[PDB]
Design a protein around this ligand. Structure first.
Ligand code: 1KI
Ligand code: 1KI
Ligand code: 1KI
Ligand code: 1KI
Ligand code: 1KI
Ligand code: 1KI
Ligand code: 1KI
Ligand code: 1KI
Ligand code: 1KI
Ligand code: 1KI
Ligand code: 1KI
Ligand code: 1KI
Ligand code: 1KI
Ligand code: 1KI
Ligand code: 1KI
Lengths: 98, 98, 98, 98, 98, 98, 98, 98, 98, 98, 98, 98
């Protein structure tokens, strides 16, 4: 079970170059992410919200937030004359300069 | 079971160049993502919202949010004279410069 | 079971160049995504909303949101003189410059 | 079962160049996506909304949203003098410059 | 079962160049998408809305939305002097420049 | 069962160039899409809306939306002096320049 | 691809009885047999005889045998008052004896 | 790919009875057999005889045998008052004796 | 890939009875057999005889045997008042004797 | 990949009875056998005979045997008043004797 | 990968009875056997005979045997008033004797 | 990877009875056997005979045996009034005798 590979796997005489993701000026809020996850015979239970109650009576204002991730604010990014955020990959092999 | 591969897998004499995603000026809010997920014989239960109640009586205002991810705000990005966020991949092999 | 591959798989003498996605000035809100997901004999249950109640009586205002992901706000992006977010892949092999 | 491949699969002497998607100035809201998903003998249940009730009585206003993803706001993108977001793939092989 | 392929599959001496989709100035709202999905012996149940009730009595206003994805807002894109978002693929092989 | 292929499949000595879709100034709302979907012995049930009730009595206004995807808003795109979003594919092989 | 079946296949309410071959007093010599063979995308090479030489000079006797199976002898069977070698299959269902 | 089955396959309410082969007084010599063989994407090479030489000179006798299976002898069977070698299969179901 | 099955496979409410082969008074010599063999992506090479030489000169007798299996002798069976070698299978289900 | 099964596989409410092979008075010599063999991505090389030489000169007798299995003798069986060698399988279920 | 099973596999409410092989009065010589063998990604090399030489000169007698298994003798079995060698399997379940 | 099982595997409410092989009056000589062998990513080399030489000159007699297993003798069995060698398996469950 060879699952996640970046290169030579049961191979011969390879020249591999692999880059990866970049981010420049990103503002995320309450996000989830799974990159390269492998379950084998497992049993999970993720991110549930259960049994929520909320009562109001003769009140003038009520603001409630329930969740896995609550974001109530400013998530700002400001850039100016920003230069260079990149993943470079170079590979060279089996050269015969004679 | 060879599942996720980037390169040579049971091969010979390869020249492979692989790049990857980029992001420049992205604003995400309450997003989910799964990249390269593999389940084998597993049993999961993800992201459920169950049994929510909300009562109001003679109240003047009631604002409620329930969820897996609640975002109530500003998620802003501002760029100016920003330059360069990219994934480059170069590969070279089996060259005979004589 | 060779599922996800980018390159040579049971091959010989290949020159492969693969790029990937780009994003420049993207604003997503409460989105889902699955890229390269493989289930084998698994059993899942994702993203359900069950048993929601909401009562109002003699109230002047009631604003409720229930869901897997609730976004109530501004998700803005502003760019100006932004240059370059791209994935490049170059491959070269089996050259005989004599 | 060779399912997703980008390159040489049980082949010989190939020169392959593959690009990928691009995005420039995109605003998505509450979207779903599946790219490269493979189920084998699995059993799923995704994105259901079940058993929702909503009562009003003598109230002056009631605004409710239930769903898998609720977006109530502004998802804007603004670009100006933005240049370059593209995936390039170049491949060259088996050249005999004599 | 060779399902999704981009290149040489059980072949010899190929020169393949494949591009991919582009997007420039796109505003999607509550859309679904499936690109490259393969089920084998699986059983699914996606996107159902079941058992919804809504009662009003002597109320002055009631606005309700139920669904798999509810979007109540502005999803706008504005571009000006934007240049270049395209996927290019070039391939060259078996050249004999003598 | 060779289902989806772009290139050489059980072939020899091919020069293939394939492009892909483009989008420039597109505004979609609550759309579905399936590109390259393959079911084998599977059983699905997608996008159903079942058992919806709605009662009004002596109320002054009631606006309800139920569905798989509800979009109640503005999905606008505005472009000006935008240039270039296209997928190009070039292939060249078996050239004998002597 | 349902290939070899003995019974109910995607059916309901069946009563099936299947017998099979018998042999009583059989003498086989250098025989081949294939019962229920299925090739899928395979490549075989069975039972070849290649490059055989035989030289004699001033010899008084030369007896040579080459082959996939050489039988030079007695393969005899003798029976007397032998009784019973048969495959019986009985099936009974959905009987309502009242 | 449901290949070899003896019974119910994706069925309901079946009564199946299957017998199998019998042998009584059998003498085989240098025989081959394949019952229920399935190749998928495999490559084999079975039972070859290659490059055989045989020289005689002034000899009085030469007896040679080459092959996959050489049998030079007696393979005899003798029976007398032998009784009973058979495969029986009985099945009974869904009987309502009232 | 459900390949070899004897009973219920993805079924309900079955009554299955399966017998199997019998042998009484059998004499085999240098035989091969394959029952229920499954290759997947494998590569084999079975039973070859290669490069055999045999020289005689002024000799009075030469007896040679080469092969995968050489049997030079007596393989005899003798029975007398032998009784009973059979495979029986009985199945009974869903009986309502009231 | 459910390959070899004898009973219920992904089923419900089954009554299965399976017997198996029998042997009474069997004499085998230099035989091969494979029952229930499964290769996955493997590479084998079984039973080869390679590079055999044999020289005689002025000799009076030469008897040589080369092979995977050489049997030069008596393989005899003698029975008298032998009784009973059989595989029986009985199954009973879901009986309601009232 | 559920390969070899005798009973219930991912099932419910089963009554299974399985017998197995028998032998009474068997004489085997230099036989091979494989029952329930599973290779995964393995590489083997079994039973080879390579580089055999044999020279005679002015000798009166020469008897040579080379192989994987050499049997030069008597392998005899003698029975008289022998009774009973069989595999029985009985199963009973879900009986309601009231 | 559930490979060899005799009973309930991921099941419920089973009544399983399994017997096994028997032997009565068996004489084996230089036999091999593999029952329930599983290789994973292994590499073996079993039972080879390599580089054998044998020279005779003016000798009166020469008897040589080379192999993996050499048996030169008597392997006899004699029975008389022998009774009973069998594997029995009985199972009973979920009985409601009221
Ligand atoms: C596609 C292919 C692929 C291929 N791959 C080999 C060895 C790989 C290797 C060998 C050793 C290693 O260690 C590793 Br890693 C990897 S031969 C071969 C042949 C082919 N064809 C389609 C040839 C068809 O035409 C016949 C000749 F014209
Ligand atoms: C011509 C060219 C030009 C070029 N320019 C770049 C800017 C990078 C950067 C510049 C500034 C930054 O801040 C960052 Br981060 C990154 S990539 C690139 C690629 C290419 N090719 C297609 C060459 C083909 O290769 C031959 C293979 F055989
Ligand atoms: C002509 C060219 C020009 C070119 N220019 C780029 C800008 C990159 C960049 C520039 C500024 C940045 O900030 C960043 Br990030 C990235 S890619 C590119 C590719 C090409 N080709 C098609 C060459 C074909 O290759 C021959 C293969 F055989
Ligand atoms: C040409 C070819 C070449 C080829 N090469 C392999 C490497 C195996 C390996 C195995 C183990 C290792 O360690 C190494 Br290195 C390498 S499989 C294979 C298959 C093929 N075909 C023509 C399959 C066409 O039909 C497919 C049906 F879909
Ligand atoms: C002529 C050309 C011109 C060209 N120009 C680009 C701009 C890139 C860029 C420029 C600025 C950026 O900021 C970024 Br990011 C990226 S791609 C490109 C491709 C081509 N071809 C079709 C060459 C064919 O290749 C021969 C294969 F055999
Ligand atoms: C082609 C394709 C290619 C493809 N490639 C992936 C990468 C996965 C990966 C993910 C993570 C990793 O680490 C690695 Br390595 C690899 S998904 C995918 C889906 C597809 N289709 C369904 C479209 C069919 O094309 C038509 C051809 F005619
Ligand atoms: C495909 C399928 C799949 C399936 N999967 C189950 C249990 C999974 C599980 C249960 C528990 C677990 O822990 C795990 Br892991 C996994 S029942 C079932 C039924 C079916 N069908 C009837 C489909 C018939 O389509 C024919 C049209 F083509
Ligand atoms: C459908 C299929 C499915 C399939 N699944 C495998 C799993 C291997 C594995 C190998 C090792 C592991 O550890 C695991 Br987990 C799993 S091979 C395979 C082959 C096929 N076909 C040939 C179908 C072609 O016929 C369509 C006609 F309808
Ligand atoms: C089927 C096949 C299979 C195959 N397997 C190899 C190496 C295996 C290995 C090599 C080394 C190892 O260590 C191991 Br484990 C395993 S080459 C090869 C070639 C072929 N074909 C020609 C098939 C042509 O038809 C396809 C569609 F019809
Ligand atoms: C039917 C069958 C049944 C069968 N059963 C086996 C047991 C394996 C085992 C071996 C060891 C164990 O421990 C266990 Br549990 C289990 S091989 C085999 C082969 C076959 N065929 C090729 C004939 C196809 O039938 C026609 C139907 F229409
Ligand atoms: C009826 C049925 C029923 C069924 N039941 C399963 C158990 C899964 C399980 C999975 C994990 C566990 O832990 C347990 Br317990 C149990 S698969 C399955 C498939 C089917 N079909 C109709 C498939 C027909 O098409 C096949 C194409 F060939
Ligand atoms: C009538 C009968 C008689 C009968 N007699 C045997 C001898 C066994 C033996 C006797 C002596 C031995 O040494 C050995 Br080992 C074995 S099997 C047999 C089967 C049957 N039927 C067809 C009954 C049908 O079943 C109803 C299903 F619904
Ligand atoms: C009637 C009968 C008789 C019978 N007799 C045997 C001898 C065994 C033995 C006798 C002596 C031995 O030494 C040895 Br070992 C073994 S099996 C047999 C089976 C049957 N049936 C077909 C009954 C049907 O079942 C109803 C299912 F619903
Ligand atoms: C075949 C089948 C199988 C099946 N298996 C279940 C639960 C198993 C289990 C449940 C829980 C466990 O813990 C274990 Br272990 C095992 S329901 C079910 C229904 C069916 N059918 C209706 C198929 C009808 O044929 C299709 C068309 F012909
Ligand atoms: C009738 C019968 C008779 C019978 N007799 C035997 C001799 C055993 C033995 C006798 C002596 C020994 O030395 C040895 Br070891 C072993 S098995 C057998 C089976 C049966 N049936 C078919 C009963 C059906 O069951 C109902 C299920 F629902």
């Amino acid at each position: 079970m060879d699952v996640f590979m970046k290169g030579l796997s049961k191979a011969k005489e390879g020249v591999v170059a692999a880059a990866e993701k970049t981010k420049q000026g990103v503002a995320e809020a309450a996000g989830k992410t799974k990159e390269g996850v492998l379950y084998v015979g497992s049993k999970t239970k993720e991110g549930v919200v259960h049994g929520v109650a909320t009562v109001a009576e003769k009140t003038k204002e009520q603001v409630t937030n329930v969740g896995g991730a609550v974001v109530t604010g400013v998530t700002a990014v400001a850039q100016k004359t920003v230069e260079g955020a990149g993943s470079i990959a170079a590979a060279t092999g089996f050269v015969k300069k004679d």
